């Protein structure tokens, strides 16, 4: 049975590689504190305080907390991530299991200056999953508070909150309030455990590979085309130079002129920034020159935006202003961190199919030329979908997110999340957890006011998550060797992806998925 003196689960951290499948399992130790002193609170921000209109909000913070494993380093060790990206053309999630076990509730009393902590054996926690998607879904915004990448670390559970419609700092009639105690929930004492299972819906494999061809090079280099293009509008001669028409076939020496079947993907142009700072304009342009969208009178940066190549050839010092993912190095500051404290990703691989984020999409015609008027052209800085476009998605990273919830709407176009990962109409459900309030002694004459005098408590336990992943094997006939992700050979003060002398785990660099190649 389950009692005070027996454990309700075991520690599972493992990975198993079987054929076309890999199964990861992770266990961590968590600590859960009481939030808001058991209260729900209205929160808002408005111009009155001095915020700009672009930052206003209205919402609620709750006493509850939630579990989040939406980063890949929750499930994969760095060596496992190497096995995946060097050997496979793609992967996708299939199913998951979740367990919550070995739960301990503790009470802390304050007397004079000294603080003491004891067990409370009869207290509970409450847990439920939102399986019908009835709550605002705050997973998928890339918040802090996921399970730690390193299995020995103990993490704090984050507080749940949400936003609803606002006008300035005020609410409107359509604004919704939610009470989370209004769902069914399971209550657990120190001997109880909790578990559920979930199945992923069909989703396309993430493409982990780069193309070894480019979209404008798909032709046979040895042969002419049978089609023709207009090669000459004027006679080339001694003196006159009158109007003429002349035509040529496309061939090996004019590839720019040949007829083609396909177009590069869409473009929304970003401003370019150099990591060599003396090359930048001297001014503070991050917001005023930023790439933005405009919704209901608010301006919001398109960050990272649609997938575009970070730079062209030999340009690596440049990046789009708001167009890339940027991670932190360990102990990086929250505000105004220096360039040496952060890690910049590069989407450079998709340069074959996708326009570079800092250039125009192309050129079109402005006017109607004639004998009287010379022709004029114009530059295309944003281009939506054209028939014949092909494109790649943004890459995924070991530090980065896995899935997002597709918003429930009448229509969408190519619902792949812009921060990267798998779009899901029915994502893995969110998991809510709370300490049950325990009153301090009531008065001995009746009073109708709600009791707000409590014994301070927190809880701890273990959590397990297990995901099964499907693999897509690499079939290539390429003769020469591939690029692989590898560790450095040379000696160093510390080992990458390990602890230091102080005990702190760190991740030296971001690692994407695209190493193997494939024909376009």
């Amino acid at each position: 049975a389950d009692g005070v003196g027996s454990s309700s689960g075991n520690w599972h951290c493992d990975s198993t590689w079987l054929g076309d499948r890999v199964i990861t399992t992770s266990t961590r130790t968590w600590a859960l504190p009481t939030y808001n002193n058991h209260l729900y609170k209205q929160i808002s921000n408005g111009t009155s305080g001095g915020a700009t209109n672009d930052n206003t909000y209205f919402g609620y913070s709750t006493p509850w907390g939630y579990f989040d494993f939406n980063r890949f380093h929750c499930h994969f060790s760095p060596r496992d991530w190497q096995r995946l990206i060097n050997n496979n053309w793609g992967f996708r999630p299939k199913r998951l299991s979740f367990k919550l076990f070995n739960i301990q509730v503790k009470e802390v009393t304050q007397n004079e200056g000294t603080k003491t902590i004891a067990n409370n054996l009869t207290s509970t926690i409450q847990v439920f999953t939102d399986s019908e998607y009835q709550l605002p879904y705050v997973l998928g915004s890339a918040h802090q508070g996921c399970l730690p990448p390193f299995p020995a670390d103990v993490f704090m559970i984050p507080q749940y909150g949400y936003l609803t419609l606002n006008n300035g700092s005020q609410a409107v009639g359509r604004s919704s309030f939610y009470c989370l105690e209004y769902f069914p929930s399971q209550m657990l004492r120190t001997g109880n455990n909790f578990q559920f299972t979930y199945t992923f819906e069909d989703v396309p494999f993430h493409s982990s590979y780069a193309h070894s061809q480019s979209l404008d090079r798909l032709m046979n280099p040895l042969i002419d085309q049978y089609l023709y293009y207009l090669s000459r509008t004027q006679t080339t001669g001694g003196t006159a130079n009158t109007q003429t028409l002349g035509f040529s076939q496309g061939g090996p020496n004019t590839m720019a002129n040949q007829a083609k079947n396909w177009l590069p993907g869409p473009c929304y142009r970003q401003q370019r920034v150099s990591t060599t700072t003396g090359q930048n304009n001297n001014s503070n342009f991050a917001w005023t020159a930023g790439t933005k969208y405009h919704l209901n009178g608010r301006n919001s940066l398109a960050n990272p935006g649609i997938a575009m190549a970070t730079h062209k050839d030999d340009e690596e010092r440049f990046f789009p202003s708001n167009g890339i993912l940027i991670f932190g190095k360990q102990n990086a500051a929250r505000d105004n961190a220096d360039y040496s404290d952060v890690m910049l990703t590069s989407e450079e691989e998709i340069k074959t199919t996708n326009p570079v984020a800092t250039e125009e999409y192309g050129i079109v015609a402005d006017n109607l030329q004639q004998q009287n008027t010379a022709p004029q052209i114009g530059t295309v800085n944003s281009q939506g979908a054209l028939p014949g476009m092909v494109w790649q998605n943004r890459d995924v990273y070991l530090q980065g997110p896995i899935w997002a919830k597709i918003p429930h709407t009448d229509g969408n176009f190519h619902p792949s999340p812009l921060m990267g990962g798998f779009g899901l109409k029915h994502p893995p459900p969110q998991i809510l957890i709370k300490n049950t309030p325990v009153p301090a002694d009531p008065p001995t004459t009746f009073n109708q006011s709600k009791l707000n005098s409590f014994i301070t408590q927190y809880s701890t336990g273990q959590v397990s998550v297990e995901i099964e992943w499907e693999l897509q094997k690499e079939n290539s006939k390429r003769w020469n060797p591939e690029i692989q992700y590898t560790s450095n050979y040379y000696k160093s003060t510390s080992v990458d992806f390990a602890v230091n002398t102080e005990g702190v785990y760190s991740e030296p660099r971001p690692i994407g998925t695209r190493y193997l190649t494939r024909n376009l």
Partner: nanobody
Amino acid sequence: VQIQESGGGIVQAGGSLRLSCAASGRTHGMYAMGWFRQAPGKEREFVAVQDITASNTHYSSAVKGRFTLSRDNAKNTAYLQMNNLKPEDTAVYYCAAGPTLMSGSYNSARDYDYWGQGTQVTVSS
């Protein structure tokens, strides 16, 4: 939701001084009412706190055995009576209020929403 100090003054050592505090509105607020003090050039220190029903009460170690905290819900006020005063009790006392009383966290300033202007109490020997 204004808290307001009263009863400030200067006293010789051993005298009995009485600080008072009042609020306006939200009797569904002001659940917990208490006192802090900040001496010259020093950190703010929690002095006392009591809840609405008078069931739960706490005094600071230095404060205990000399001060008593009392409360009148009708007037929506709270009083602090002070006995056997020592000149290290010169400080600026703040009435403080909050929606909740916790057993671990009550002595932290993080748990109080509202703060008065303060009072100056001087104690001489």
